[PDB]
């Protein structure tokens, strides 16, 4: 981050070992700086998969998960959803308290491998978060 968002007091709480890596990840998940960038300009089966990719490194498992996380987002908002992912057993066994999450490409969910390959490292983030000025896409050239 180019001297950007970061987390004031969160780096200090990490370095002094007051906070764990999982706790810092949960703090980063629930904030204005994550909500504005990964929750505003998106519909609401897709925020769930972006959140699951960022915190678990994969696509959503099955259609039944877009009942659970969808209802969590609808009723208790973004913070409860971000806490549910962090407190999920899948996060706990794979990462637990003190390892930074990473891309995984799992094998066992029967299609999650190709889903994870597509969602990360095959498709990047479109739809810039701010709605303040669109590109008018009529000037592709820098001739002079």
């Amino acid at each position: 981050p180019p001297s950007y968002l970061r987390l004031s007091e969160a780096e200090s709480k990490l370095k002094n070992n007051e906070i764990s890596v999982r706790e810092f990840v949960r703090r980063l998940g629930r904030s204005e700086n994550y909500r504005k960038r990964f929750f505003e300009p998106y519909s609401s089966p897709k925020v769930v998969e972006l959140l699951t990719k960022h915190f678990l490194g994969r696509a959503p498992i099955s259609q039944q998960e877009i009942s659970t996380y969808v209802q969590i987002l609808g009723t208790k908002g973004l913070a409860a959803a971000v806490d549910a992912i962090v407190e999920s057993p899948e996060y706990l066994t794979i990462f637990n308290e003190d390892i930074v999450p990473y891309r995984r490409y799992p094998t066992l969910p029967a299609g999650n491998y190709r889903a994870s390959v597509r969602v990360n490292d095959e498709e990047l983030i479109s739809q810039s978060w701010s709605s303040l000025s669109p590109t008018y896409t009529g000037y592709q050239y820098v001739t002079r």
Binding site: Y42, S43, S44
Partner: protein, 161 residues
């Protein structure tokens, strides 16, 4: 998300132009209707559950959807339907307050049609339910915000259909 003011500021920032008489006219036109929007939003927030059960009774229940073989049968699928309905009500309130369907296109309609096709949810039935909620909201709010409430319900219905 963009509101009316943000949309005007967007249309002038893209051209790199200061605000002129036309932009001021649009902003003033939004400004003169602010209080009615607040009152209607408060009314809808206070009567959300009432409008939901009324719309369900008028458009959904007492039919094959609530019977075996229907889509809304079982408490889980009925809960999904009413939770979607509450989503429609709350996001319509947001769009009406902001004076823009940007929230409706952004956080509601994107991919909803394909999602409903994948799950087998009845698009016509949900459109009829949203219309029943539109009629109930128009009855509750009064003449001051009836049309401004109904326009975003119509926007939602046209997005689904």
């Amino acid at each position: 998300m963009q509101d009316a003011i943000t949309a005007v500021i967007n249309n002038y920032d893209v051209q790199g132009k200061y605000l002129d008489g036309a932009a001021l006219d649009k902003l003033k036109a939004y400004f003169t209707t602010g209080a009615v929007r607040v009152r209607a939003a408060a009314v809808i927030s206070s009567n959300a559950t009432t409008i939901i059960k009324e719309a369900a009774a008028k458009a959904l229940i007492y039919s094959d959807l609530t019977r075996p073989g229907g889509n809304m049968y079982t408490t889980r699928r009925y809960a999904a339907c009413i939770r979607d309905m509450d989503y429609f009500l709350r996001y319509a309130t947001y769009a009406m307050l902001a004076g823009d369907p940007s929230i409706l296109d952004e956080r509601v309609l994107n991919g909803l049609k394909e999602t409903y096709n994948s799950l087998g949810v009845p698009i016509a039935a949900t459109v009829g339910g949203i219309q029943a909620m539109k009629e109930v909201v128009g009855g509750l709010v009064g003449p001051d915000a009836a049309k401004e409430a109904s326009i975003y319900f119509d926007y939602l219905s046209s997005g689904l259909s």
